[PDB]
Design an enzyme around this catalytic site. Structure first.
Site, short mmCIF file in Angstrom:
data_model
loop_
_atom_site.label_atom_id
_atom_site.label_comp_id
_atom_site.label_asym_id
_atom_site.label_seq_id
_atom_site.Cartn_x
_atom_site.Cartn_y
_atom_site.Cartn_z
N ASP A 1 6.69 3.88 4.38
CA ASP A 1 7.30 2.69 4.98
C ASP A 1 7.54 1.62 3.92
O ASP A 1 8.68 1.23 3.66
CB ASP A 1 6.41 2.11 6.10
CG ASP A 1 4.97 1.84 5.69
OD1 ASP A 1 4.64 2.05 4.50
OD2 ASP A 1 4.18 1.38 6.54
N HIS A 2 6.45 1.21 3.28
CA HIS A 2 6.34 0.08 2.37
C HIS A 2 6.76 0.48 0.95
O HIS A 2 7.78 0.02 0.47
CB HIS A 2 4.93 -0.54 2.51
CG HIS A 2 4.65 -1.01 3.90
ND1 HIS A 2 5.36 -2.06 4.45
CD2 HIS A 2 3.80 -0.60 4.85
CE1 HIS A 2 4.96 -2.24 5.69
NE2 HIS A 2 4.01 -1.37 5.96
N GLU B 1 2.66 -8.68 10.24
CA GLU B 1 3.08 -7.49 10.96
C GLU B 1 2.97 -7.79 12.46
O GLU B 1 1.93 -8.30 12.92
CB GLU B 1 2.12 -6.36 10.61
CG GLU B 1 0.75 -6.53 11.28
CD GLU B 1 -0.35 -5.51 11.06
OE1 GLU B 1 -0.03 -4.40 10.61
OE2 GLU B 1 -1.53 -5.81 11.35
N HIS C 1 -7.03 -1.48 7.25
CA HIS C 1 -5.89 -0.57 7.53
C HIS C 1 -6.07 0.78 6.81
O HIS C 1 -6.26 1.80 7.51
CB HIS C 1 -4.56 -1.26 7.19
CG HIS C 1 -3.36 -0.38 7.28
ND1 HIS C 1 -2.71 -0.14 8.47
CD2 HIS C 1 -2.66 0.27 6.33
CE1 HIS C 1 -1.68 0.65 8.26
NE2 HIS C 1 -1.63 0.92 6.94
N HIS D 1 1.90 3.71 2.03
CA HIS D 1 2.74 4.27 3.08
C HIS D 1 4.21 4.42 2.66
O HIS D 1 4.75 3.58 1.95
CB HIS D 1 2.59 3.48 4.37
CG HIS D 1 1.45 3.90 5.24
ND1 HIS D 1 0.89 3.06 6.18
CD2 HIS D 1 0.75 5.05 5.31
CE1 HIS D 1 -0.13 3.68 6.75
NE2 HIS D 1 -0.27 4.88 6.20
N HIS E 1 8.30 -6.73 11.07
CA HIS E 1 7.66 -5.43 11.26
C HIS E 1 7.04 -5.29 12.67
O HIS E 1 5.84 -5.08 12.84
CB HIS E 1 6.73 -5.16 10.07
CG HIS E 1 6.10 -3.81 10.01
ND1 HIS E 1 5.00 -3.46 10.77
CD2 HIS E 1 6.38 -2.73 9.25
CE1 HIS E 1 4.66 -2.22 10.52
NE2 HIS E 1 5.49 -1.74 9.60
N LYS F 1 -13.42 -45.09 -8.78
CA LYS F 1 -14.78 -45.44 -8.43
C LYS F 1 -14.80 -46.75 -7.64
O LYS F 1 -15.47 -46.83 -6.59
CB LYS F 1 -15.62 -45.53 -9.71
CG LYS F 1 -17.11 -45.81 -9.55
CD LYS F 1 -17.87 -45.28 -10.79
CE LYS F 1 -19.39 -45.38 -10.72
NZ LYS F 1 -20.05 -44.43 -11.65
N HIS G 1 0.84 -1.20 0.00
CA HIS G 1 0.00 0.00 0.00
C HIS G 1 0.88 1.25 0.00
O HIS G 1 2.10 1.12 -0.06
CB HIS G 1 -1.05 0.01 1.14
CG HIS G 1 -0.43 -0.14 2.48
ND1 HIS G 1 0.13 -1.32 2.91
CD2 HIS G 1 -0.17 0.78 3.43
CE1 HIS G 1 0.68 -1.12 4.09
NE2 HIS G 1 0.51 0.18 4.43
#
EC number: 3.1.27.-
Lengths: 590, 603, 298
Positions: A71-72, A200, A154, A69, A411, A459, A67
């Protein structure tokens, strides 16, 4: 069949989330980050794998980014030109729209601070190499590997990604909130049974209700401030964080309403308003429904605030811009609020941004700035975990739904992680890691080999199953192309081998005085008596059968004292056949 | 595989696929030509309807319940909708229902609330909501006026034989029902689970179904039903190019064992683009002369494509101050969805609309059928003026049925039907590439259309079976091989014992036990057939190595006999036949058996 | 008109012609004495017809005729049973079993019902037929006594298909609702399948756990299970809580009603409740307060 996971920037360290993952022959980087609070040495988490193969494309098959942020995805533009990555960078559709927005804004703050940073030019270059993957959409990135998004909550665009190449699935789950915070319901993953789950561990301590607790705390804090011109100085690092702050202010006004004064994020709150409205699908189900029938996120107060809150000593509720940065609007605001009784400041996020984070932790009055500035604070510092994230209870729950063979902790800080690791190890019957930066876990799995059966065979065996002991025979044909399981006979027919028969005839010698004429009748009657529930026959030519074993009185021997019984069977009936002959060697009733 | 076809119309198919021990109802559709058959029902009493005569059917019996307009009979009951036959296959046994397009998903709530069914409908998020507001729109229109008290009373075969042409041609008469309530609508929408595109939603660990993108209006989801061996693909509302919606996934529909194609152009001579252009011209012409314009359209799909063109023409023609008044309850919702994914919309007629009404305008109204909705009332007002025009943009309903009850109308009548759905040429080019072995598609496609002699009909190399109503058609596929995974810790090892016969073929004796957990197969460990020939020379040498003395070999017809004189034993060695004859000495038998077996392959 | 119908059925040109005629006849209702007429005729046709499609509808027609108010299904249950023994495609057999269930409920006489039940135990053992199995479970459940029946149903509790699993649970559930008393064996079986992969199964499972919980609250579970011995109801309440926190939106709905309806939960456990985990979907939220208030009285 070994899957090697080495966090280059994640692991024991929070922020710079980067996790390389080698499921089978495929390498996949899970994030690439800009650890904050450091002037240098942390722009990009150092790349061991880059140093080895000159071109990243060759070594790395694929890159999934969680996503927006910093951070990522913050150091995602690092990779445009300098280390020269090409390939499908996979983010969810909400992510990729907001991703350049935060990239460029940080780009702005960095240049006013010289630094060999990515220009907008190269950020755009990197963004042009991006594929958007919808929710719960299985997309084959390669011939073999595929990746599926999930709902991580989030923020709008938080995608939980499961990279599966074969039967072994590594499912990263980064920044997932297990409660229905505003703009987001609870994160659901189905029952994949992945081999490795990566989580996380930011909160390794179990917390109270995400929404109610955070409302109570907020209201109390606001009331406490309000006594003598109670100021608000709140850092907000995201578009959807600003909206959360606005909703909290709305709640304050609803409960209290004593002071009219309201402030907004920044000048361009128009934009955040815009983006949230745009992505109605992704938002919390209930919230979307409420939006389709009600007005969303009214704000016109920011402009009024700015002028009012220009170093003046009033009640204005200012959520400033990037709080935990070298410089910014937020730093200016903090400097304005510094050293007055009025001032109360709230750390809404995790407040872990290197040096600024450390300062927040110990809350020293005598704080030293990076530059030669002396600032002494005498406001009240309170932190609340209003940030969208999963508590250690939540981590347990999602581990539950996935129920993997093993888990890996990234994390969080090591201390916190250690306790969490211990808990998970005790609680569920799995062995879980907590590796440091640059340390790999060679978690052995084994290969699970897919082969096709003959439906007839299947079978028949299924039928055998239900009446009660269930042993099943038959051969594999192995061209390395189309592994198949076929029947004994079917395989024989396929390779064109002729129909063999191994036959035994054994001569049983009877010694009694009964007449030769009566032998077959005596044999029939004795074996019919003894061999309960066996098909036993006396045939019109005088021979006797036991299932498919043939018994025939032989011609007179040249020993008057002996009568020969021929007993015959094929190899398939050898067990019954030799049983009968051992039985008959005792002789007949006499 | 047996596919049961439960609905006649090409447009809405409702075809039920029994396959791999799991049955699927590929669509649920409400036809609505039956509704066009009844006499139109106005919001406010219309003089004409009250003063209408009967058709003088006589023959005893009914003069109350049959009317005459312009020499065509109608019926003085509420419009009743034809629904897919329910009788040929029980609904219970059809497990899940897949629903393709929002237009094609009507009649879902009929079945769910009437005739018993306990499964989960799978439909992609857009279509569910669009379909929801469309049925709500439909229910509102029929319940705005409570004239459903009356009974049709014409269904009898005898009555049908005598009465005239318009009614005569009803394919079913007895299955017609009055419209469902808002409760049933709710139940239906509740049972739908919202599944995104390319999502591999698997039912009961048997088959894997996934809604591919079709190219047609938002929510258009053609489906593929695969089982690791047979891929069956279902191809409805699958317009190739329609701009905004994500395009048709031909590649994902490729290499399908059995393709069902059902959605296809209602009009083969559609010429979409040209018709859009003509539409807008005509509208312009009439607003210029000062007469009004009436457009009967639905609340999604065609409406928005026609709106974008109108705006452009106004920009280009400077024909402003002509209010584009869209009148429908769910107009609110309709625009909302457009936003989510100079026109003024008013949910209520005789309200905001009445206060704001201007002398010329372009009014996009309630229903294309012209029986139930707001169109009816405006049609009546503007009928008597030559100036005023009506444009039929909708293919669903034939030009001429609407014209039928309102035949003495002054309004200039224009037909501008636009269908974005694959053309027959498009379907032909699609199917060469997709390359499926058998294709099932209605009779309608099989033969050229009644109207035109020309050979535009849908043809494939395999000469595809034509569906029909109440026709259970079995295609030529038996399942031959099914998957079964092998265990890791216990099994792999024991089942990794290959013995090479050929360079590219190997053989391994697999013994294990199978747990059939949640319909998946896993074999894990808890007399063989023999093949080969006995080389006599090497056999005797083996016997000699094991100490047997006094061995003699003789030639016999078709083989040899080996005589072990020291052991009173004969071994007859023939092609595919070894016969060991000895005394009752089990140890001796076993030793000879073992020596023979060493020369034979075990399977 | 009975003998005309006879003639029409055979005169069918093709297999699918026959099919439609039967379908059309379905849509015209039949009186007491004509229903006897047509049943016989339709059985006769069934014998001689080689296409399953038509056999299947013949069976549906048969069921419809069984359900006729005037009609009493006697002298043709034996025929039905006879055809069951010598039939060959699973779909048709399942349809016939459905007809048999309809017949069973039509007349409440002890003898014939029992016969039918035995017949269906025989048909219960059918293999790689998900549908004969389900129909059989249903019928057992429907025609059942007041022990053997209950014992049988656990076999199919642990079955390959989740679709059979569910049916078994519902069948037991049905047996309760006709005034029978389930055993604590059933309780243990229900606790064993509360955590199956499929959503259906879980739904049914808690339903049953609640059922047996209300049946034996006073009884206790001796097994410590890592704690001291506590009441059956105590554990049932606990298991139903867990489900509130399960990963489905409809599994929670199951739990919520049952959690609220629980009685004589120990004051300790009842106080401790995590029923304040109301979130996400607002339907569940609203539902869980309703019964809260019903039982705050208590």
């Amino acid at each position: 069949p070994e899957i090697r996971v080495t966090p280059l920037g994640a692991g024991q360290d929070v922020g710079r989330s980067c996790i390389l993952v080698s499921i089978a022959g495929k390498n996949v980087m899970l994030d690439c980050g800009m650890h904050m609070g450091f002037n240098d040495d942390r722009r990009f988490p150092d790349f061991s794998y880059i140093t080895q193969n000159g071109r990243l494309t060759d070594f790395l098959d694929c890159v999934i980014i969680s996503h927006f942020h910093l951070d990522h995805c913050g150091a995602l533009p690092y990779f445009s030109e300098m280390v020269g990555y090409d390939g499908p960078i996979y983010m969810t559709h909400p992510t990729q729209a907001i991703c350049p927005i935060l990239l460029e804004d940080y780009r702005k703050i960095a240049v006013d601070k010289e630094a060999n940073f990515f220009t907008s030019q190269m950020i755009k270059d990197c963004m042009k190499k991006v594929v958007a993957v919808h929710l719960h959409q299985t997309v084959q990135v390669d011939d073999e590997l595929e990746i599926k998004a999930y709902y991580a909550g989030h923020v709008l665009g938080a995608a939980m990604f499961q990279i599966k190449v074969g039967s072994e699935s590594v499912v990263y789950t980064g920044d997932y909130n297990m409660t229905p915070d505003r703009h987001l319901g609870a994160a659901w993953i189905d029952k994949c049974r992945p081999n490795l789950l990566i989580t996380e561990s930011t909160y390794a301590t179990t917390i109270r209700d995400s929404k109610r607790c955070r409302e109570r705390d907020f209201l109390k804090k606001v009331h406490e401030t309000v006594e003598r011109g109670g100021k608000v100085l709140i850092p907000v690092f995201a578009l959807g964080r600003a909206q959360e702050l606005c909703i909290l202010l709305e709640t304050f006004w609803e409960r209290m309403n004593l002071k009219v004064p309201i402030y907004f994020s920044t000048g361009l709150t128009e934009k955040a308003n815009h983006y949230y409205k745009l992505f109605i699908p992704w938002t919390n189900q209930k919230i979307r429904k409420t939006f389709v029938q009600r007005n969303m996120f009214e704000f016109k107060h920011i402009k009024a605030f700015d002028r009012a809150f220009a170093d003046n000593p009033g009640p204005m509720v200012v959520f400033a811009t990037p709080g935990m940065l070298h410089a910014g609007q937020s730093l200016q605001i903090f400097r304005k609020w510094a050293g007055n009784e009025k001032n109360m400041v709230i750390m809404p996020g995790y407040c872990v941004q290197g040096t600024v984070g450390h300062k927040i932790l110990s809350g020293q009055r005598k704080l030293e700035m990076e530059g030669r500035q002396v600032l002494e604070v005498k406001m009240q510092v309170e932190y609340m975990s209003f940030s969208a994230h999963a508590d250690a209870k939540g981590i347990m729950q999602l581990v539950g739904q996935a129920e993997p063979e093993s888990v890996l902790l990234v994390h969080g800080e090591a201390k916190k992680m250690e306790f969490l690791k211990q808990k998970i190890e005790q609680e569920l019957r799995v062995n879980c890691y907590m590796p440091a930066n640059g340390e790999t876990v060679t978690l052995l799995t084994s290969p699970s080999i897919p082969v096709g059966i003959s439906l007839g065979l299947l079978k028949r065996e299924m039928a055998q199953g239900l009446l009660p002991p269930r042993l099943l025979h038959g051969t594999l044909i192995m061209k390395d192309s189309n592994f198949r399981l076929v029947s004994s006979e079917q395989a024989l027919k396929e390779l064109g081998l002729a129909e063999h028969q191994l036959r035994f005839t054994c001569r049983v010698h009877l010694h009694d005085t009964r007449k030769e004429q009566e032998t077959a009748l005596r044999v029939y009657s004795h074996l019919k008596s003894v061999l309960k529930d066996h098909c036993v026959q006396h045939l019109p030519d005088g021979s006797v059968t036991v299932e498919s074993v043939l018994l025939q009185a032989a011609a007179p021997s040249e020993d008057p004292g002996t009568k020969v019984l021929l007993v015959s069977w094929t190899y398939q009936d050898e067990e019954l056949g030799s049983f009968l002959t051992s039985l008959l060697k005792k002789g007949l009733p006499q | 595989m047996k596919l049961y076809c439960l609905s006649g119309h090409p447009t809405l198919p409702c075809n039920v696929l029994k396959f791999k021990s799991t049955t699927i109802m590929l669509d649920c559709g409400l036809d609505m030509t039956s509704t066009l058959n009844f006499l139109p029902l106005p919001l406010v009493q219309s003089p004409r309807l009250s003063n209408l005569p009967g058709w003088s059917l006589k023959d005893g019996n009914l003069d109350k319940e049959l009317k005459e307009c312009s020499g065509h009979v109608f019926v003085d009951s509420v419009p009743e909708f034809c629904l897919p036959e329910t009788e040929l296959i029980d609904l219970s046994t059809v497990d899940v229902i897949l629903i393709s397009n929002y237009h094609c998903m009507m009649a879902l709530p009929y079945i769910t609330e009437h005739t018993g069914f306990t499964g989960t409908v799978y439909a992609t998020e857009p279509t569910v909501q669009i379909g929801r507001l469309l049925m709500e729109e439909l229910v509102n229109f029929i319940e705005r006026v409570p004239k459903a008290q009356s009974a049709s009373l014409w269904k009898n075969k005898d009555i049908q034989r005598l009465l005239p042409s318009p009614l005569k041609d009803a394919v079913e008469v007895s299955t017609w029902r009055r419209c469902y309530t808002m409760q049933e609508v709710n139940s239906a929408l509740s049972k739908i689970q919202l599944v995104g595109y390319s999502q591999k939603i698997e039912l009961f660990g048997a088959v894997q179904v996934t809604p591919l993108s079709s190219g047609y209006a938002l929510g258009s989801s053609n489906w593929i039903i695969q089982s690791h061996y047979e891929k069956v693909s279902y191809v409805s509302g699958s317009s190739l190019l329609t701009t905004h919606p994500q395009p048709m996934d031909q590649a994902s529909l490729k290499n399908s064992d059995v393709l069902v194609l059902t959605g296809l152009t209602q009009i083969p001579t559609a010429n979409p683009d040209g018709m859009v252009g003509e539409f807008c011209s005509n509208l312009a012409l009439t607003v210029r002369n000062g007469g009004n314009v009436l457009v009967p359209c639905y609340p999604s799909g065609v409406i928005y494509d026609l709106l974008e063109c109108l705006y452009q023409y106004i920009d280009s023609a400077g024909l402003s101050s002509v209010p584009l008044y869209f009148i429908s309850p769910v107009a609110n919702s309709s625009l909302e969805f457009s936003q989510i994914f100079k026109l003024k919309h008013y949910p209520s007629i005789h309200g905001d609309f009445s206060n704001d009404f201007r002398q010329p305008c372009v009014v996009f109204t309630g229903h294309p059928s012209l029986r139930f909705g707001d169109v009816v009332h405006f049609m009546e007002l503007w009928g008597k003026s030559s100036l005023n025009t009506v444009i039929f943009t909708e293919p669903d309903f034939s030009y001429l049925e609407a014209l039928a009850p309102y035949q003495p109308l002054a309004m200039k009548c224009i037909y501008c039907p636009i269908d974005t759905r694959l053309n027959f040429i498009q379907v032909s080019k699609l199917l060469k590439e997709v390359q499926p072995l058998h294709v099932v598609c209605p009779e309608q496609y099989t033969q050229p259309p009644p109207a035109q002699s020309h050979r535009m009909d849908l043809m494939i190399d395999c000469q595809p079976p034509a569906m029909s109503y109440r026709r259970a058609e079995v295609l030529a596929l038996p399942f031959k091989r099914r998957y079964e995974k092998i265990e890791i810790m216990p099994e792999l090892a024991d089942s990794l014992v290959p013995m090479e016969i050929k360079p590219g073929i190997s053989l391994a004796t697999v013994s294990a036990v199978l747990h059939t957990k949640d319909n998946k197969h896993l074999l894990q460990p808890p007399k063989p057939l023999l093949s080969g020939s006995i080389p006599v020379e090497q056999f005797v040498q083996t016997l000699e190595k094991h100490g047997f003395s006094d061995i003699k070999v003789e030639d016999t017809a078709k083989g040899h006999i080996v005589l072990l004189q020291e052991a009173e034993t004969l071994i007859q060695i023939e092609e595919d036949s070894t016969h060991i004859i000895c005394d009752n000495d089990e140890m001796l038998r076993v030793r000879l058996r073992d020596l023979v077996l060493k020369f034979l392959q075990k399977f | 008109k009975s003998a005309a119908l006879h003639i029409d059925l055979c005169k069918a040109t093709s297999p699918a012609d026959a099919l439609q005629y039967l379908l059309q006849f379905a849509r015209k209702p039949v009186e007491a004495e004509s229903v006897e007429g047509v049943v016989r005729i339709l059985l006769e046709h069934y014998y001689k017809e080689n296409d399953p499609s038509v056999r299947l509808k013949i069976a549906s027609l048969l069921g419809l005729l069984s359900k006729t108010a005037g009609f009493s299904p006697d002298c043709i249950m034996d025929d039905a049973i006879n055809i069951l023994q010598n039939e060959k495609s699973h779909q048709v057999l399942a349809q016939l079993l459905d007809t048999l269930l309809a017949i069973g409920t039509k007349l409440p006489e002890n003898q014939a019902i029992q016969m039918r039940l035995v017949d269906v135990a025989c048909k219960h053992l059918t293999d790689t037929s998900h549908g004969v199995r389900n129909k059989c479970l249903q019928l057992l459940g429907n025609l059942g006594s007041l022990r053997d029946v209950q014992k049988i149903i656990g076999d199919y509790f642990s079955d390959q298909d989740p679709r059979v699993r569910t049916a078994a649970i519902k069948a037991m559930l049905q047996l309760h609702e006709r005034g029978l008393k389930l055993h604590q064996t059933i309780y243990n079986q229900a606790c064993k399948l509360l955590s199956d992969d499929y959503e259906q199964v879980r739904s049914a499972a808690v339903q049953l756990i609640w059922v047996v919980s209300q049946l034996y609250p006073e009884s206790i579970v001796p097994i410590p299970s890592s704690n001291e011995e506590i009441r059956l109801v105590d554990d049932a309440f606990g298991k139903i809580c867990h489900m509130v926190s399960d990963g489905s939106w409809v599994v929670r709905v199951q739990a919520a009603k049952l959690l609220g309806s629980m009685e004589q939960v120990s004051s300790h456990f009842l106080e401790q409740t995590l029923d304040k985990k109301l979130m996400s979907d607002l339907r569940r939220k609203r539902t869980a307060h309703e019964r809260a208030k019903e039982l705050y009285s208590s």
